[PDB]
Symmetry: C5
Amino acid sequence: PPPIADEPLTVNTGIYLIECYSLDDKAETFKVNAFLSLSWKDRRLAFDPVRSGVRVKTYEPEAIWIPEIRFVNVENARDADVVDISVSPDGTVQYLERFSARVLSPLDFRRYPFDSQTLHIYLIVRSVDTRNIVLAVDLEKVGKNDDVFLTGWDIESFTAVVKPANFALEDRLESKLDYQLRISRQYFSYIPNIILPMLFILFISWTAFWSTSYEANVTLVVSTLIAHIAFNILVETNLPKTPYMTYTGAIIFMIYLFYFVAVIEVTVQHYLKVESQPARAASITRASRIAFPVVFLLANIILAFLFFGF
Amino acid sequence: PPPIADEPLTVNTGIYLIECYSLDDKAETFKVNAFLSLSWKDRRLAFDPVRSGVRVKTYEPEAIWIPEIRFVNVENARDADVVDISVSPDGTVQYLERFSARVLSPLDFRRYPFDSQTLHIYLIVRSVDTRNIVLAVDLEKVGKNDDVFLTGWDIESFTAVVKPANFALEDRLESKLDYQLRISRQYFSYIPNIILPMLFILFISWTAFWSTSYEANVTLVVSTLIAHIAFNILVETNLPKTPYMTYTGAIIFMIYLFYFVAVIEVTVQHYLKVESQPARAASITRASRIAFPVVFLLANIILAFLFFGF
Amino acid sequence: PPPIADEPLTVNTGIYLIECYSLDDKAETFKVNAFLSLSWKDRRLAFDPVRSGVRVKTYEPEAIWIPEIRFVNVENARDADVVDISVSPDGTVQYLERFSARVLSPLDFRRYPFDSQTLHIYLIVRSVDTRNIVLAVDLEKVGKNDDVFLTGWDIESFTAVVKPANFALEDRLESKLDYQLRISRQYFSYIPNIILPMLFILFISWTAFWSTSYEANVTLVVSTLIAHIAFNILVETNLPKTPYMTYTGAIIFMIYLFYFVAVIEVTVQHYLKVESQPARAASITRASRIAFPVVFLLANIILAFLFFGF
Amino acid sequence: PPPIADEPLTVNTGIYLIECYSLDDKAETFKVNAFLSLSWKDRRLAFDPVRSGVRVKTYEPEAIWIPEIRFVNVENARDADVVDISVSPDGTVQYLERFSARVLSPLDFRRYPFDSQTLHIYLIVRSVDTRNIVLAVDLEKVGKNDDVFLTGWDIESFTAVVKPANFALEDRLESKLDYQLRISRQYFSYIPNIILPMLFILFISWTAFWSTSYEANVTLVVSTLIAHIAFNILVETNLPKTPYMTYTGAIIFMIYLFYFVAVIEVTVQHYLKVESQPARAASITRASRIAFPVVFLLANIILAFLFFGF
Amino acid sequence: PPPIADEPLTVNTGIYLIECYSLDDKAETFKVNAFLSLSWKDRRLAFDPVRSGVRVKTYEPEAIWIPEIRFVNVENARDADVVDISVSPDGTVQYLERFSARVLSPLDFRRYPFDSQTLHIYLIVRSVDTRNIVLAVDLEKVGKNDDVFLTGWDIESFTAVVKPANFALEDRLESKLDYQLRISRQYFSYIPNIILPMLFILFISWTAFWSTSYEANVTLVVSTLIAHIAFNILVETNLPKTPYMTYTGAIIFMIYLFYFVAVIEVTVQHYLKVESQPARAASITRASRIAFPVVFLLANIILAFLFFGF
Ligand SMILES: [Zn+2]
Ligand SMILES: [Zn+2]
Ligand SMILES: [Zn+2]
């Protein structure tokens, strides 16, 4: 029984994030539990303050006509249990629920460990004979407690795009709003646990420049290369199949090279020291000692700049 | 109370994919959330526009007779919540729901990382005394937003086979339609993370052709063969027990050989250098240096062609 | 309100497998989506064809008395949504649902990768004052499309045991039927990915018979033994804790031995070549070169026969 | 509307395990699907056999007063769907459901792989004005088919403690019963797959007593120690964070030592063979050859006894 | 229909933890199953003991007005099934449910393995026209059986903050209480399985001070550094991305250094023993033998103190 209007009836939305959790980098989803605040004039149940009852009148959902606010990017039906409904006398309805859905928003691992993100919640609303425009009431959208969690992420700001998007979808205009959650990652644990460890093994790799034993230079560079895959794999796991390149996928892959040419050198400093020409051997070996760290540190500046500095 | 007809009553279907996600290569399933649009003439509730009410009349599902449209390939009952029902005066009924099921469609990993796929959604409909033919209404089948996701897959086209398939099933004809989702994979992350790494280790393997130390030739070829299993295993994991052969299962397996005859060579260049005949040793070793990469690159041309080029 | 009979009322069952999927070797369960066809004479709603209505009369589930057909081996309540109900005039009722349950049937990994299986679905039915015998109507049991999936399994036949099993269970006889799904595995992917790889490493292991370097004979046999665990572990994972012995658990375990006595030999061809008695060393080493492959190939014939040939 | 009594009304319980599965060693839970049989005299619906109807009268749950039997140790609300309700004329009610809950019972990994366990199901019942004692009716508790599964566990006996426990809980006595499921593990797969493999690597470790090459004695003892962690880690995984000590956590940890003093010896048999005193070297090395296996086999007798023999 | 009051109606709460389980260090959540006890004077259904019925009168939830007690930090709607409702004659209502929700409380891994924690449960309550203050009734808050589980955690105390927090939230004051669960970890399994094993490998690392073979000093220090990553990784896994530093993240990271300067030394005791100056070599090497263990044991006193002793 939709409220007999004279024009597109506007419905007034808001979202108070009570809880944030389970942001899943692989699945590109997160889980939110929040308030959903709605309101609209249904003059059709305006009601004589003095003549009866009190200031505001409470209803159950079945009584009143309520607009179907479906979320757009959601695994399943959003799990909202209802909070209160209060009709003003001007037939203005005050609705409040408290849902929990898991939300499908995409992420940009281009700067993987040092990445900031922007999440989205949607809310469409399909029309019947009266159109529905949705729109944001900002006193009920300050939604986000002084408690919101989201492990391993610093939470920057919860806002929304005042102007809705009115589509036509199947001979019935719908109206969709954009609620925005901005977060930066707490890169850090990414250092003592990945970044540094990964580097260390790489240095020991090329300990093999100040050595001459092949057996202990392969027992050297090879043994560490194994370890690097242990990281490449550790990392590749908590991360989806990007069709593009990650920052650390980059340096992690750039690394694979420095092990190759490293192994190349130790290898040459052999078919070039068994050929009686150690003139050249401890010439090259002596050189690599510099080339390598420089080319590297150079490539990181080159690489790093390429990603953040552009 | 099914609508009294004169012939097989046609029901008119459509599907607007709102969401695609969780394509599971191992399980050969995916998850879709979409609109389901139905329609049919139930002259039995035609209704005098002028004489009463308005243009189109809204019903709840319990009122009208609605045809049971079950999906054919689905884990469980399809999770449809209903959107709107609108009856035309000519007794023409307009139905819309918005379901989410997980769908069991098979995949062909014959060209694994470089494979394109074709998914299916079905919709049978069993008859009573009047027969039901289903059929596609293509204005409601353009279904697939400008947003459809499906991580790590490029989505090519969502169409449907206009002609239904009318079975006899248990002394009651059913009618089944075929909705078709065509996708190609985003092979790519499969390169810096699998394809290349896998190759690199293989090359270092046969660094041991320009070497003479057995200890460092086993510390060599053996240490890398281990790593190859690390990949063979990484890959075998995100992939089901194909009764046929994958492309990368192929090359991954072809590889195992090049490590064998590699180890064979290093082994021979020993019971053939301890037998005082290094005439032959650094003859063979000198040879392998060429045989190997060639036979390989040859075998990949041979292999590759065999899969894609046919 | 159960149908007033003169003897045990027979209910007539059938199952049309629409979908098969998610066979879980570890959990020993699978998931089926199929038709469930029932029928019985409830003379109590026989109905004068001419005198009223038509040939067959349609009912909703609440109207008629329907027999409770519970499945015996199921995680949870079977998820059946209903298809059609049609009463013949002789008071003969025609019932059809389309359930999806996950089914707990056990498997015999005695021939693991080369194993055929036999799955079960049950259907008991508890009596009240009239007994219920169930029984199979074979036109509705040809159930199994020309499409049934079940990844990595060849599907052999879907039949059923005509004679039911009438128990006494708690002062009320129940009646249980046995629907039988026979499948053989698509062993194959088990070869390029497990069987062969596993063998190769074993051969390279004993490359160390044509070698004399201990360092490269341990860097040899040891480095490969690691790899074998990689497989032993890979395999032990997609497989439950059998109280009995698997075929490949067998050969996988028989293998562990050939690495031991292998390492034993390399070890002895050392405290027996450092003891100045290489008379014996390259006598043993020379021997092992034959003993090993033979004892093995012998043990596999012995082993293989023991499992399949008996 | 609870049955007007003269004393604490006794309710008579029973449980027929139809299915057992998903015992989770880490989570210390399992999943059961079983019958729940209840009964009590509600004289309030006694009913004149002759004067009307028949022997026993069937009700739906809404009609009769039924006692709330909540299970005590359960993740969520127990998922019971109802089977039959039959009232005797003496107003004696016969209730049957068939629930499936996942149950939280603790385990004692003190003898980990060789451990027998005892599981628990509870059933409290809170009173109103008449008290409720629960109690067991043992013809309906023989519950446990000739089919109950529970992978990798031998099932010993399903009994129950006849005497309930009547608490006071919040100014209302509740009554709790204890249903007991006793199981021993199928240790076995724990041998070819953990126990033996683990030992083997340990022996090869100390192959390095009959050797003199440091490079091949570290390439020896070190290479195997790695493998041991591979097991320590494999094992630690399928097992929770015991605040106490496991049996295999013990021997697995005792092992770590024999690798240490092993490495110690090889290390000493070096700064004691580079110090020109091989008088002592192949004296110690010669000794270790015995000390080690003995101390070990001794420590296992010591250890093993400590756990099982006490 | 809320109870007509003269002032802010106080609602009286309590929680009897029946079950604790699934505390998830990564996710920072846990799962509780407990009683929720409420009460308030609704003089509006006070009721003449003598004049009718009995001492206390039982209602179903639909009859009475009940206050919406939502939990503040919860993944989803709290899964409460209801226990009993009893109205006193003074119109005092006695409510009891038994919910199970999973609860989102944060943890402080600053002293990781040796960390005590404090969990929280909340309960807000939004007002209408009469305000609601919540408050704690301590006879129903002794909640926590003599059975509460929580694997790998010693449970210290379940209390609550008597004074509620009355917010203004969206032109309606809500009232929130704080239920407090204090737990310390059962660090211990953290020793035979992490702490010790991790130390051992570190000592063997620097076995390479009493050695001179580079090949066996890299086959030494390098082979163990690999193992250390095996732990660094094992540990980093059961632990979230702390924006701060863990205690063991500390020592685990401090360790990485002692392997570096260790490898540095072995490396120098080479380009300083190939330079004919073993004057210095077995001077340094002789020194490290002390420096290392001391600096370490010193740094742990330094480190340890820094964390616990402050
Ligand atoms: Zn259109
Ligand atoms: Zn060596
Ligand atoms: Zn009283």
